[PDB]
Amino acid sequence: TDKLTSLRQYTTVVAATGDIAAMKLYQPQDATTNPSLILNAAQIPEYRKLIDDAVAWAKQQSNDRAQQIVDATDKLAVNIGLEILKLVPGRISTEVDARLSYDTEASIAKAKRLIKLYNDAGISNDRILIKLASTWQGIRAAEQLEKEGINCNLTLLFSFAQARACAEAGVFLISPFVGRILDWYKANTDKKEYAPAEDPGVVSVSEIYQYYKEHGYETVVMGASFRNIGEILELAGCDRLTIAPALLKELAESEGAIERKLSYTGEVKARPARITESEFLWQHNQDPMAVDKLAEGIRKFAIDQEKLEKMIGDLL
């Protein structure tokens, strides 16, 4: 059989895209989106209908141009999620405005607003994951949201300190990155070529997976961001993996079964005391790669958010 089919025996397959065409081809269980993917999807000609509905709905909610742009942008993200939910049995991940990444209260409010829009469309909370950046503020927001019945997807996770803080907050799922970690090493280190087993991104997710299973944490581990199929195959066994359409195609066209790589067969160990903000900040900033990438990831998503607002602005 093919690699994709084989991988499904050990790992739940998730598609990283806002394009419904991929949902029909690979039949993933869940789908994930982010500000950049939403911006790109808005370019798809067939999605024109989704944009017009968002704008029309917005103008029916208020007569304030400022509020219309925000309502239109949020509704568009939700409308795209709605189309995807028609083709997948699982969940859709929708990300909150990245400009609120360092504001706990504002993030909680925005998350509840998005949940409200999904509910108004008839979708219940068990089919959604609100996506937030893994800053200390985002983690504190998620801990509160989970208590109120809203499940979260903690993304842009680079350091071990982030992974630990997320597990202790009891979040539903984490999206530790692989590929962006590789990018950092290729650009700031001597070694430009890495064997799958020594890929820094692969090692990071593997260590996080071990820590989570070893201590009985229920948080779902979903590896994200890939540069080649080698990284994916090296993580076979991870709870879930969200993969871009291009790599999904490569897996489906290659023959040969694969072997499970990630597993924890021991018994659960006792959990340590919770990490404090001071300890979190110290440990996270000890990692040069994580310091650069977390901040950069937030900057980029914020820029794409602004570009989307521009686009919608010229339509009001």
Place this chain on the structure above:
Amino acid sequence: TDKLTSLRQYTTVVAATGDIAAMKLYQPQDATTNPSLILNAAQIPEYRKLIDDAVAWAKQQSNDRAQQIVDATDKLAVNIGLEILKLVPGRISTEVDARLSYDTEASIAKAKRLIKLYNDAGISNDRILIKLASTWQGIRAAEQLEKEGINCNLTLLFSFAQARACAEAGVFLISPFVGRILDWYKANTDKKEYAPAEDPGVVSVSEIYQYYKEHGYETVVMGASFRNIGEILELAGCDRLTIAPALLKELAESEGAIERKLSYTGEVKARPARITESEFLWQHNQDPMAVDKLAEGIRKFAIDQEKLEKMIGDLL
């Protein structure tokens, strides 16, 4: 006359070193030290006496080896400050353990401990500046310390958000860096050569100086970290400048008077509302250079602190 003598007309000269030999040669008003300079100074043969006194004093305060290492390391920093105060009319800056940079309460406690050691030696608070890293936590610690009569020197300042937060906290003095900013651009940008007027570090301090004077802030602006005399001359007029012995020598050996570059001749403007933690974090992380350098600066000072403890450990 020479450049050094000329610069003194517009700017208060400060020496960046723990070596007393420089105090006698350039007669600066104040002197600044940091963990790295303290580590190097400990290597100076004539300072052997200072190390032995620190260790002896420590063993007389407690019988706990762990506490002796901390008491010895802190006392050594103070003993070096004491020698310098004999040769300068102004203040000495002593830095708190960089490992506490993200802990407000621990930083306040350590600062008071250092002040205690200076007081026990008969030195009053008006001859000292406690040096802390400009993280949000360090700034909050400084605001509290100033209210209790302890003046602070906020260092490792790279972003405008840091400069603004420091002014609003009413700290006694800030040490915005110049040279380390240049290093970042030379390593992460195409342009490897900069004319003095276009040096990123020079532009940063100039903008901060303008903002402070324009709004009537009393915080002293002291530029720090230099790579060449061109940067120094371009900042003539800054309240104070702390310079390494090597560049101090170059200024004293070059002939020709210089012209004042930094000035604010307008009237004071009204101050805006105070920046909040969320706004601070967003703005600081918008600056790639500042994100990298603040974290890096803290890591290095922490490593030098550990090396000093090792050295002292083998003497107990």
